[PDB]
Amino acid sequence: HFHQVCTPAMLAIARYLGQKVPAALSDFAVGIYLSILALQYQDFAKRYVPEMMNFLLNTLCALAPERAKSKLGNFPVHEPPAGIRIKDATNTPIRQLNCGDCLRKDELSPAETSSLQIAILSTATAILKSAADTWHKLPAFIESFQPALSVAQHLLTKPNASHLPSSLTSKLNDLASHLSRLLQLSRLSRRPLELHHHRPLA
Amino acid sequence: SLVSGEKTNFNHILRLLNTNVDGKQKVVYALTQIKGVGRRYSNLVCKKADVDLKKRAGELTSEELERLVTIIQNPLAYKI
Amino acid sequence: TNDLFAVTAGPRVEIFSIRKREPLKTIGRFDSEAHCGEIRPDGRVLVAGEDTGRMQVFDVGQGTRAVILKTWHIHKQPVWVTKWSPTELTTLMSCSDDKTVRLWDLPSNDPTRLFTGHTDYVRCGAFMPGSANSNLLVSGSYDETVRVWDARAPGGAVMTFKHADPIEDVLPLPSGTTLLAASGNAISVLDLVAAKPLRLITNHQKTVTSLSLASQGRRVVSGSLDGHVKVFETTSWNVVAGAKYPSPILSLSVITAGASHDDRHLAVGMQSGVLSIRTRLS
Amino acid sequence: PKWSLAAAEALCRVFVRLLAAGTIINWLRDRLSDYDGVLLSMLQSLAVHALVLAMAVLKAQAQHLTDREEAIFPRSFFLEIIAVVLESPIEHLRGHFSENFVKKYDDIRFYTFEAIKHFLTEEDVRNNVFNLLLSIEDVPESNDSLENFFIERPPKKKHPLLSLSQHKKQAQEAWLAFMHLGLSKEQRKKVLEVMSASIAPWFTKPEMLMDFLTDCYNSGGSVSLLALSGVFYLIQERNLDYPEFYTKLYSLLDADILHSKYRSRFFRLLDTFLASTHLPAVLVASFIKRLARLALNAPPSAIVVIVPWFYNLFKKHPLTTFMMHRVPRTKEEREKLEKDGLDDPFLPNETDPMETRAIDSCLWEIVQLQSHYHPNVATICKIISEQFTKQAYNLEDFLDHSYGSLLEAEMTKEVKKPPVIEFMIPKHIFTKAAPEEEKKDSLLVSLWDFG
Amino acid sequence: LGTVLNQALRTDDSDLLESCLQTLIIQNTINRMDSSLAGTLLSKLAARMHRRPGRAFGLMRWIQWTLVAHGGALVTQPDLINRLTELSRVLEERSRGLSSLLALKGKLDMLDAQLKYRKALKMAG
C-alpha cells in the first residue's frame, strides 16, 4: 500500500513524467525509461499512472509524421520544437534502445535520428501493449484507451504511412485490433456504479 | 445565473473552546450550550458583546466569534 | 383590505406592514432557509417552505402570532414555491427541488395530487387566474421547460414550452389567456388559448428575476440582475419605464392599497441584504 | 567626492535654514536654481542620500517659496526628479524611493502619478515605470484614511489632495496611459495576475479594464485563464456582465489547465462559480463529469484538490448524487444491461453544459482513479467511496500543493521505521533470456539492449 | 470601453452612459461597437443635446465618429430615419441664432480691444 522509499521513487518518476515538455530525443528516451519503470512498479498491483498515459500519447503525437491536427485525446499536447519528428525515412529498420541515447547530441546525424525515433516508437508501442494487458480492468479503461486508438488511427493515416515503415505499421495494426478487442470487452462488461449500499446501524 | 451564496453554509457543527460541537440555534442558546455557562450569563455576555440576539449561531463573522471567545475567556477584564 | 405583505430573506420571514411599512413580526422557526412565504387570501395564514424539505403553515393574526398549524415533511428536499389557489382557501401548490409539483389540501395529511414531467430543479410556478382556468397549474423549471397541467387528469402537462434559458419566473394574466415566462434575459409572452408563443422580448443584459403585475392588470414591472427595474404595457410590450438600483436585485413587487387596488407602493429586494421601498400615496 | 557629499548636505542645511528664516533676492534664488542642477548631478551619482537631500529641498521649497500660507511646490522640478530616477538603472535607488516615500506619503503618491503622466507623454524605462506602478499596492479606504501628508495637510476641506477620488483618478489615468502606450507579454501577465488585488481596486471606473480584460479573456489560453480573475472582480463589483458566462466557463476548462501553474487561483474562483445558488443541476453535473474526465489525466497535486470539492458539491446538490449510486429500476433494464454492457450517455466535447447528458452517467473515472499509485490520493478517492459523514471539506488546506510538497512530506517523514524488502531476488536482473530459470524476463530487459 | 457601451446601450442605462461619456480610445470604442445600439446611442445623444445645451466639444466629436464608423449602419437598417429625422430637427435648432449671432460678436470683440488697450495703457501708466 505504502512505503518509505519505494513510493517517493515513484513520485520522482511522476514529477519527471508529468512535467518536462521534451526538448530532445534524449528526454524522449529517458521518458520511455521511466514509463517502463513505473510499469514494472505497478505490475500485479494494478495502480495507474495518468502521467505515463498522457506522456506516452504526448510522445506518440510529438513524433509528428504529419501533424496533431485536431481532437487527439485529452492529454496535453505540446509542440516538437527542433524538427523533432519523423520524416519519410521508412527504410531505417527497427532496433532496441541503448543508454547512450540518454546523451544530448545537437550534431546528430539525421539517419541516426530517424532510426532512434523509430526505435522509440516501437518501444512505446510495446509499452502500450503491456499497459493495456495490465489494465483491461479498472473501469476507466474506455476513457483512458480511446485516445490511444485515436492516436493509433491518426498515425495509421496515409500522410503518416508515407513516413512509416511497414514494421511499425503491422505493430500499430496489431495494437488497434487488440485494443478494440479489449475495448469491446470493457464495453460489454461495464456496469453502472452503486456505491452507497450502506449497512444501517443497529 | 450567478447569485452569491456567501451566507448559505451555516448549518454545521461549530468547534469552540471546550465543546467541538455547537450547532446553529441562536446566540444565547449556543452560549448556554457551552459548558458551565448560564442563560442570563449568556444574556450578559452577548449584551456586552454588542451582538444581535436576532442573529442565529453561524450568522457571525470570525472577528466577533473570537471576540465572544476572548470575552468568555476573561469575564473580569470586561467589568462584570 | 389588509395592511400586510411578506418578505422572505434568509432563515426567517418578516411580516411587514403596508401602512407603517415596518417589519411587524419576524418568524424564525425556519431551520435552514425559506424559499417562499406567502399568505392565504384571508390574511390570517402564512405558509412557507424551509430548506430541509419541510413546508410549514402557521397562523398569524395581525401581529405577534406564530402558531404552527401544520407541518409537512414529504419532499425530503427543499421546496422553492408554495402558493395558494387564489380562489380556494384550502389548496396550495408546492413545487419542490427534486422533480415535483403537487397540490395539497390543508386538512389532508398526504398530498392531494402530484404532477411530474420536469427534469431539473423546479423553481417558479403559479395558479391560473380566470373562471374556466379552474384547476390549472403552471410551473417553470430550470430545465428550459414550462408546463401547465390540469388537475382533472393527473397525466403529464397538457401543455409545455421549451426555451433556451433557465426559466426563473412565470406569471399568468388576469385576462386568464396570456402568460409571461421569464428566462435568462428573455421574457416570452405566450397564448394559452392557442398554445402559441406570441413574442420573445429582451431588454435586459443579465438574467431576470421576477415579474410583477401592476396597476390594474394593465402593466408588468420586471426585475433583473442588471440592477434594473423595467415596466412594460401589456398591449405592445414596449419598455415603458424603469430605474436602477445600486445592487443586483432578486425579488420585486408592487402592491396595491385598498379601494379598487390602486398600487400603494413597490419594493425591490437586492442581494445586498437591502429591502428598498418606494412609496406613493393618494 | 565624499567631500562633495558633505558640501551638498551642508548646503541643503544652510538652504533650509535660510528658507526657515526668509535686487538681491534674484541671486538668492539663483543659488537654489543652480543647486537643483547640482542635485540632478548628485542623483546621477551616494544617490540614495542625494535623494534624501532632494526630498528635503522639495520640502523647504514648498514651505517657503511663496508669500501665501499655502504650500505650492514645483511640479516641474519633481517631474525631472521623476525623470532622472526612472531613467536611472539603480534598482536600489528605485527601491529606496518607492519604499521610503511612495509607500509612505500621499502627496508624493499623487504628484508622483501626475509626474509619470507628463513624463510618459513626453522600453527598459517602460519596465522601470511598470515596476513602480506595481510597487504602489495599497488603496486607502477613505478621505480620512488618507490622514497623512508629507507637506501641508490642506485646510481646503474640499481639496483634490483631501479627496480620495482624485488620487484614485490620477493613478487611474496612470494605468490608462500606460496601457495606451503599450506593454510586453510579461508585463501583461503580471498585470493580469495582480490586477484585481491591486490595480482594479485603483479605478474610479474600471470599465475600460472590462473592455481590455474581456478582449484578452476572449483571446484564449493561459492569459484568458488569468483574465478570469479580473472579469469576476468586475461582475461582482459593478455588474457589467459577459454574455455567456457558464458555457464560456465549461468550454474554458480544458486539458492543460490543471497542469497550469495558476490553477489554485482558478479553483478558488470556480469554488465561487459553483457556490452560486441559481444553478441548474445538469450544469453542475456537466462540470462534475468534465472534471472527472480530466482527472483521468490530471496530476495528483491537482486530484487532491479535485476530490473534496466534489464532496462539497454533492452535499449541496443531491440531484447530482445519482451519478454515485445508480440503480436500474426495472428488471427489463437489468436484462438489457446484463445483455449489453453500458455506454456512457454523457457527451464529451459538447459545448453547452446544460445539454451534456452528464445526468445518467457515473464516476467510473474517479473510482478507477482510486487505484492511483499515490496512497494519500487513493484514500481521498476512498473518501468519495466510503460514506457521507463530514458536513464539508475546506479546500484551503488542500490548495497550493505540488510534487514539491509531496517530496518534502515524505522527506520530513521519519528517517526509517524499519522497512521491508523483497526476498528471493533473481540474479538475471539484466540477463536477456535466462531460459534455465523459468522466471520470465524483466520487460525492461526484453525491450532494452544492454551491450 | 466598447463592451461597456454595448452593455449600457442595449440595457438603456443612464449612469453607465454618463460614466463612459465623461471622457482616441473613444475612436477605438466606436470602431468596435455595434450598429443597432449605435443608432439608439445617436437617439439618446440627440436627447442630451436637446436637454442641456452646454458642451458640444466631446459629444459632437462622438457623433462625428459614429457617422465615421457605423454611418452606413443606418444605411443598413434604414427604417430608422425617424431617428435621423429629429437630428435634422435637432441640429437645425442650434443653427438658429447664427443667422445674426455674429452681429453680437464684433461689437463685443470691439469693446474687447480698447479694454485690452486701455488696460495695455494701464501698467504703462
Coordinates of C-alpha atoms in Angstrom, one line a residue, chain C residues 63-248:
Chain C
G63 CA -49.1 40.7 14.6
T64 CA -47.3 38.6 17.2
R65 CA -48.9 35.3 16.3
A66 CA -46.9 32.3 15.2
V67 CA -49.0 29.3 16.0
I68 CA -47.7 26.5 13.8
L69 CA -50.9 25.0 12.3
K70 CA -49.4 22.2 10.3
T71 CA -46.1 20.9 9.0
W72 CA -45.4 18.5 6.2
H73 CA -42.2 16.6 5.7
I74 CA -42.7 14.8 2.5
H75 CA -40.2 16.1 -0.1
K76 CA -37.0 15.5 2.0
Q77 CA -35.5 18.1 -0.3
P78 CA -36.0 21.8 -0.4
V79 CA -39.2 23.3 -1.6
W80 CA -39.0 26.5 -3.5
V81 CA -42.6 27.5 -4.3
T82 CA -45.7 27.0 -2.3
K83 CA -48.6 29.2 -3.4
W84 CA -52.3 29.3 -2.6
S85 CA -55.1 28.8 -5.1
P86 CA -56.5 32.3 -5.4
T87 CA -60.0 31.0 -5.1
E88 CA -60.0 28.1 -2.7
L89 CA -58.7 28.6 0.8
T90 CA -57.6 25.0 1.3
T91 CA -55.4 24.1 -1.7
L92 CA -51.8 25.1 -2.3
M93 CA -49.3 24.2 -5.0
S94 CA -45.8 23.2 -3.9
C95 CA -43.0 22.8 -6.4
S96 CA -40.1 21.2 -4.6
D97 CA -36.5 21.0 -5.5
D98 CA -36.5 17.5 -6.8
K99 CA -38.8 16.9 -9.8
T100 CA -42.2 17.6 -8.4
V101 CA -45.1 20.0 -8.2
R102 CA -48.1 18.9 -6.1
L103 CA -51.4 20.1 -4.7
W104 CA -52.1 19.9 -1.0
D105 CA -55.3 20.2 0.8
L106 CA -54.8 21.7 4.3
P107 CA -56.9 19.2 6.2
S108 CA -55.3 16.2 4.4
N109 CA -52.2 14.5 5.8
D110 CA -51.0 13.3 2.3
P111 CA -50.8 15.5 -0.8
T112 CA -53.9 15.6 -3.0
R113 CA -52.3 15.3 -6.4
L114 CA -48.8 15.1 -7.7
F115 CA -47.6 16.3 -11.0
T116 CA -44.3 15.3 -12.6
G117 CA -42.7 15.7 -16.0
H118 CA -39.9 18.0 -15.1
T119 CA -36.3 17.0 -15.3
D120 CA -34.3 19.6 -13.4
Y121 CA -34.9 21.7 -10.4
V122 CA -38.3 23.4 -10.5
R123 CA -38.3 26.9 -9.2
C124 CA -41.2 29.0 -10.3
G125 CA -44.9 28.5 -10.5
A126 CA -48.4 29.9 -10.2
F127 CA -52.1 29.1 -10.4
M128 CA -54.2 30.1 -13.3
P129 CA -56.5 33.1 -12.8
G130 CA -59.7 33.2 -14.8
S131 CA -63.0 31.4 -14.2
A132 CA -62.6 28.4 -16.5
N133 CA -58.9 28.3 -15.5
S134 CA -60.1 26.4 -12.5
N135 CA -57.5 23.8 -11.6
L136 CA -54.8 24.8 -14.0
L137 CA -51.3 25.0 -12.7
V138 CA -48.2 26.5 -14.4
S139 CA -44.6 25.9 -13.5
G140 CA -41.3 26.8 -14.9
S141 CA -38.3 24.6 -14.2
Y142 CA -34.7 25.4 -14.5
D143 CA -34.9 22.8 -17.3
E144 CA -35.9 25.3 -20.0
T145 CA -39.4 23.9 -19.8
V146 CA -42.6 25.5 -18.7
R147 CA -45.5 23.2 -18.2
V148 CA -49.2 23.6 -17.5
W149 CA -51.3 20.8 -16.0
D150 CA -55.0 20.3 -15.4
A151 CA -55.8 18.7 -12.1
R152 CA -58.6 16.7 -13.6
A153 CA -56.4 14.1 -15.4
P154 CA -53.1 13.9 -13.5
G155 CA -51.2 12.7 -16.5
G156 CA -48.4 14.9 -18.0
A157 CA -48.7 18.5 -18.7
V158 CA -51.4 19.5 -21.0
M159 CA -49.0 22.0 -22.5
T160 CA -45.3 22.6 -22.5
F161 CA -42.8 25.0 -23.9
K162 CA -39.0 24.8 -24.3
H163 CA -36.9 27.9 -24.1
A164 CA -33.1 28.4 -24.3
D165 CA -32.5 29.5 -20.8
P166 CA -33.3 28.6 -17.2
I167 CA -36.8 29.8 -16.7
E168 CA -36.5 31.7 -13.5
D169 CA -40.0 33.2 -13.3
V170 CA -43.6 33.0 -14.6
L171 CA -46.9 34.7 -14.3
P172 CA -50.3 34.5 -15.9
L173 CA -52.5 37.3 -16.8
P174 CA -55.8 38.3 -15.1
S175 CA -57.3 38.0 -18.6
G176 CA -56.5 34.4 -18.0
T177 CA -55.5 34.0 -21.6
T178 CA -51.9 35.1 -22.0
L179 CA -48.8 34.5 -19.9
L180 CA -45.3 35.8 -19.2
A181 CA -42.5 33.3 -18.9
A182 CA -39.2 34.8 -17.7
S183 CA -36.0 33.1 -18.7
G184 CA -32.4 34.3 -18.9
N185 CA -32.5 37.8 -20.3
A186 CA -35.6 36.8 -22.2
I187 CA -39.2 37.1 -21.3
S188 CA -41.8 35.5 -23.6
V189 CA -45.4 36.4 -24.0
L190 CA -47.5 33.3 -24.8
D191 CA -51.0 32.3 -25.7
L192 CA -52.7 29.7 -23.6
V193 CA -55.9 29.6 -25.5
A194 CA -53.9 28.7 -28.7
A195 CA -50.7 27.4 -27.1
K196 CA -48.8 29.6 -29.4
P197 CA -45.7 31.7 -28.3
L198 CA -46.5 35.3 -29.1
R199 CA -43.3 37.1 -28.8
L200 CA -39.9 37.0 -27.1
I201 CA -38.8 40.3 -25.6
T202 CA -35.3 41.0 -24.3
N203 CA -34.5 44.4 -22.8
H204 CA -32.1 43.2 -20.1
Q205 CA -28.5 42.1 -20.0
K206 CA -28.4 39.5 -17.3
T207 CA -30.9 37.0 -16.2
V208 CA -34.2 38.5 -15.0
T209 CA -35.5 37.5 -11.6
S210 CA -39.1 38.5 -11.0
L211 CA -42.2 39.8 -12.7
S212 CA -45.0 41.7 -11.0
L213 CA -48.5 42.5 -12.2
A214 CA -49.5 46.1 -11.9
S215 CA -51.7 48.8 -11.7
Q216 CA -55.0 47.4 -13.0
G217 CA -53.7 44.2 -14.5
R218 CA -52.5 46.7 -17.1
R219 CA -48.7 46.8 -16.7
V220 CA -45.9 44.5 -15.6
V221 CA -42.8 45.5 -13.8
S222 CA -39.8 43.3 -14.4
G223 CA -36.7 42.9 -12.3
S224 CA -33.3 41.7 -13.4
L225 CA -29.8 41.3 -12.1
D226 CA -28.8 44.3 -14.2
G227 CA -29.8 46.4 -11.3
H228 CA -32.8 47.1 -13.5
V229 CA -36.5 47.6 -13.0
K230 CA -38.4 47.9 -16.2
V231 CA -42.1 48.1 -16.6
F232 CA -44.0 47.2 -19.8
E233 CA -47.5 47.7 -21.1
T234 CA -49.5 44.5 -21.9
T235 CA -50.6 45.5 -25.4
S236 CA -47.4 46.2 -27.3
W237 CA -44.9 45.4 -24.6
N238 CA -42.6 48.3 -25.0
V239 CA -40.2 49.4 -22.4
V240 CA -42.3 52.0 -20.7
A241 CA -40.4 52.9 -17.6
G242 CA -37.9 51.7 -15.1
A243 CA -35.0 52.6 -12.9
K244 CA -31.8 51.3 -11.5
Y245 CA -30.9 50.0 -8.1
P246 CA -27.3 50.0 -6.7
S247 CA -27.3 46.3 -6.1
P248 CA -28.4 43.5 -8.4

